Structure formats: C-alpha cells, structure tokens
C-alpha cells in the first residue's frame, strides 16, 4: 500500500513537520536554581516525562511513520527518544550562548552540570552543539527535517523508511535552494547538518549510560514510561 508521505511536495512535507511540532513546555514555577543531583535531575525527569507524551503524538504526525507497524514505531521511538529530547534542547538553547534552555523558566549553565558526577561533560557536548547550530544559522524548517531523520534513522538498522529518508533529504535541499544557496553550498550544508547527527547520537549514548547509573542509584524518581524507554537500551 503506497504511503501518502512520498506523494507530498517539499513545501507540503515542510508544512506537515512544522505543524507537528510539540510545544515548548515549562518547568515548575519555583525560581530556585538547582544546584544538586536531586534538584536538577528532579526537574529534568519531570520535563522529560511530559515531553515524551508530546513526542509520541508528534512522531505519529511525521509523514511515513504512520505507515509503519506498531512494533516498528515502538522500536524507532525507543532507539531515538533521547536524541530527540536532546536535539530539541540544543535547538531551544541556540539563542542562549553558554546556556541550556531546558525550559523558558529553566536555564542551566555548565557550573550547574558540575553538580552531577559525569554531567558537565554532557552539558559541554550539548553547548558545543548549540553553538554549532547557531554559527551555522540553522533554520526552523531545517531543524524539523533533522529531528524527523533521527526518528526514522536511528533504529533502522536494528525500504519504506529509506524512501521516506530520501524524501526528507530532497526537502532539506529544497529548503537550501529556496534560501538561495549555490549547488556546492547545498551539498556542503547537507553534509554539515548530517554529521552533527553523529554527535547527537554520541550524546544520547553517553546520556543513556548516565541515566542507567542514576536509575541504579535510585533516588531520583523515574516514571514507568521513562523506565521502559530506558530499559529498551538494555
């Protein structure tokens, strides 16, 4: 059964993805800057928990995702959820050099990352990524294409998905052409953007190790949903 996704024009694909965007959630209204494992991870967990619900409904709205079997959708989300939370975080933090905008009322710096053994390194990785996005002048339309690619690519190796991925490549190019880039500039930018996905993968993997560690420590409460998403990485 032919997928509706491949019949979309570039502009339509872009509209679909922009429209599917989850909202930016707030953290608790307590203005206490977190300076402890308990405080920080408490707030990060709560936020991640709520974002997950929006992420699940977002994924259903990514063209082609719906054509997948339920099991395949589950696998892709299980593989990709942290990469997706993280690229979102990096995107939100762009206009805030040196800062991570977990929420509009929750900006953490690296000095706060130091409050969790092993966290500052991941904070530094995220900040370098945000800085990279910013110096590249990453656009919203480009961001949504990248997030969709992560969804579809990350669990793929563990044909429809590949065609959809190509469609998204076509859409990224369309956007750069629309923005006036030369041919050389298009393929170079495409390459640059996609290479950052490697680093996003890396940050997810390291973060996952950290969350498992925290899980075992067992002070920061984890929701059943987060536990299942985490357990999926074994």
């Amino acid at each position: 059964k032919n997928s509706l996704a491949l019949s979309l024009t570039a502009d339509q694909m872009v509209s679909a993805l922009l429209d599917a965007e989850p909202p930016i959630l707030y953290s608790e209204y307590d203005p206490t800057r977190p300076f402890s494992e308990a405080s920080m991870m408490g707030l990060l967990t709560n936020l991640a928990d709520r974002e997950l619900v929006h992420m699940i409904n977002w994924a259903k709205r990514v063209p082609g995702f719906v054509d997948l079997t339920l099991h395949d959708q589950v696998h892709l989300l299980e593989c990709a959820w942290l990469e997706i939370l993280m690229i979102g975080l990096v995107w939100r933090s762009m206009e805030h050099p040196g800062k991570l905008l977990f929420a509009p009322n929750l900006l953490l710096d690296r000095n706060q990352g130091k409050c969790v053994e092993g966290m500052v390194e991941i904070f530094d990785m995220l900040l370098a990524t945000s800085s990279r996005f910013r110096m590249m002048n990453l656009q919203g339309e480009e961001f949504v294409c990248l997030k969709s690619i992560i969804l579809l690519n990350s669990g793929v190796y563990t044909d429809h998905i590949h065609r959809v991925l190509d469609k998204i490549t076509d859409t990224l190019i369309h956007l750069m052409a629309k923005a006036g880039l030369t041919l050389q500039q298009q393929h170079q930018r495409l390459a640059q953007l996609l290479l950052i996905l490697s680093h996003i993968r890396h940050m997810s993997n390291k973060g996952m190790e950290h969350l498992y560690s925290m899980k075992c420590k067992n002070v920061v409460p984890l929701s059943d949903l987060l536990l299942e998403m985490l357990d999926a990485h074994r």
Binding site: I56, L70, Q73, V74, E78, D224, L225
Partner: peptide, 10 residues
C-alpha cells in the same frame, strides 16, 4: 504490555 504500545494507539 509496554506503555508505549498503548500511547502509540491513543
């Protein structure tokens, strides 16, 4: 029995 199994349907 995964929560995700349920949420993806709803």
């Amino acid at each position: 029995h995964k929560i995700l199994h349920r949420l993806l349907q709803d």
